Design a protein around this ligand. Structure first.
Ligand SMILES: O=C(O)C1=C[C@@H](OP(=O)(O)O)[C@@H](O)[C@H](O)C1
Ligand SMILES: O=C(O)CNCP(=O)(O)O
Length: 427
């Protein structure tokens, strides 16, 4: 078992040029592949999730080239739905934003493709999306456990009236939204009840528009899509820096700064996780906004009690930042933490207790009461990049922390530890 031990960090201060957004990267790659024309993506993220999408595109016959650092990609658009037969197997690691979007997109026309991934991916739900795709005409078979990958896709999505449950993942709706425009018939997507992670739907619509397609959003309850459309290359497109990856650095300043500035995202960003900065502000930190940066300067840090459904990923960073706050922090309406890279409510509660916190693991919330002082712990990371990055913050105390399997950060941020070190100061 690999591990990394982080020495106590006395202060953080500096600037970080963010790696590209995973959410934007995978959407841009899939849309560029489906579009007509050549798209040049810059500031693309090089991480496992994007690599799996790139490999999938290669396997489907899409032609593209990558720069030496894998952040510039010149994609030759396919000019329409992607195709493959012979039950071609596409391995997608544990990348939900590759798995969900491709499960929908590859239902267009005829195909015989199998989508699979790591063991955990075979335990992450996809039934709500399969249900919707089938209502639209798709033929989809569960090869193992019903409602989970792996899936054998044999095509047939033509459009029509499609209901979709948006209560567990917004990715199912995102997948439908990107696929529907290319279907032969018009599609009316009706959300069954609640819609979680709503800001990600805005990222999807933003990218679709960049690639030439707009739809009718009726207060996020129903989306009217015209079929027979075509995506078009936007030419050169700059992938925003990752706002979720930025959370660790901004939180580090809130706890132990100093001022930390992250570049690549700013006040105009489409990512909902830039709202993480508003949470740090509510806790007592000072935030500065720019056109291409966000910075955080140490102020004070007070506990908060907030519904975090709008920033589920960056919300994990508040869970460990809470170790340094005054009072008990409560993060609510985050049930789907349970169905992501690992069951994050169980994992976060378990590891937080190891460093001394008293934690109530609620069914869909977590309540954290920090200890007077933290103690050393060897942190399990559950094959979850964010468990490793969130717990790295424990080192902003008088105690070191050992992080197991630190390379798990590669899912979205391979260079995480070197970047944290960049802003770590001895004085
Ligand atoms: O659409 C996207 O890019 C994402 C949506 C979220 O998933 P849920 O909708 O399941 O919360 C998020 O957790 C994931 O990291 C990326
Ligand atoms: O990045 C995160 O925190 C959660 N991601 C889940 P995904 O694999 O992208 O569906």
């Amino acid at each position: 078992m690999e591990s990394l031990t982080l020495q106590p960090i006395a202060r953080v201060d500096g600037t970080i040029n963010l790696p590209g957004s995973k959410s934007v990267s995978n959407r841009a790659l899939l849309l560029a592949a489906l579009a007509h024309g050549k798209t040049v993506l810059t500031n693309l993220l090089d991480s496992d999730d994007v690599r799996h999408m790139l490999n999938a595109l290669t396997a489907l016959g899409v032609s593209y080239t990558l720069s030496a650092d894998r952040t510039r990609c010149e994609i030759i658009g396919n000019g329409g739905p992607l195709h493959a037969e012979g039950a071609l197997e596409l391995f997608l690691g544990n990348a939900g934003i590759a798995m969900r979007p491709l499960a929908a997109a590859l239902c267009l026309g005829s195909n015989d493709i199998v989508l699979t991934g790591e063991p955990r991916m075979k335990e992450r739900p996809i039934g709500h999306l399969v249900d919707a795709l089938r209502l639209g005409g798709a033929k989809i078979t569960y090869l193992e456990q019903e409602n989970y990958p792996p899936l054998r896709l044999q095509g047939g999505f033509t459009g029509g009236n499609v209901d979709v449950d948006g209560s567990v993942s917004s990715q199912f709706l995102t997948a439908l939204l990107m696929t529907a425009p290319l279907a032969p018939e018009d599609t009316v997507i009706r959300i069954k009840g609640d819609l979680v992670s709503k800001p990600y739907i805005d990222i999807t619509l933003n990218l679709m528009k960049t690639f030439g397609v707009e739809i009718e959003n009726q207060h996020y309850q129903q989306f009217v899509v015209k079929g027979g459309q075509s995506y078009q290359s936007p030419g050169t497109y700059l992938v925003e820096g990752d706002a979720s990856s930025a959370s660790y650095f901004l939180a580090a300043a809130a706890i132990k700064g100093g001022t930390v500035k992250v570049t690549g995202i700013g006040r105009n960003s489409m990512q909902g996780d830039i709202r993480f900065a508003d949470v740090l502000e509510k806790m007592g930190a000072t935030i500065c906004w720019g056109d291409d940066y966000i910075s955080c300067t140490r102020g004070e840090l007070n506990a908060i009690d907030m519904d975090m459904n709008h920033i589920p990923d960056a919300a994990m960073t508040i869970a460990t930042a809470a170790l340094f706050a005054k009072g008990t922090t409560t993060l609510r309406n985050i049930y789907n933490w349970r169905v992501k890279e690992t069951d994050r409510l169980f994992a976060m509660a378990t590891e937080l207790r190891k460093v001394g916190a008293e934690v109530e693991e609620g069914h869909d919330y977590i309540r954290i009461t920090p200890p007077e002082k933290l103690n050393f712990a060897e942190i399990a990371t559950y094959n979850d990049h964010r468990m490793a990055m969130c717990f790295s913050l424990v080192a902003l105390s008088d105690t070191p922390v050992t992080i197991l399997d630190p390379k798990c950060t590669a899912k979205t941020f391979p260079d995480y530890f070197e970047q944290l070190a960049r802003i770590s100061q001895a004085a």
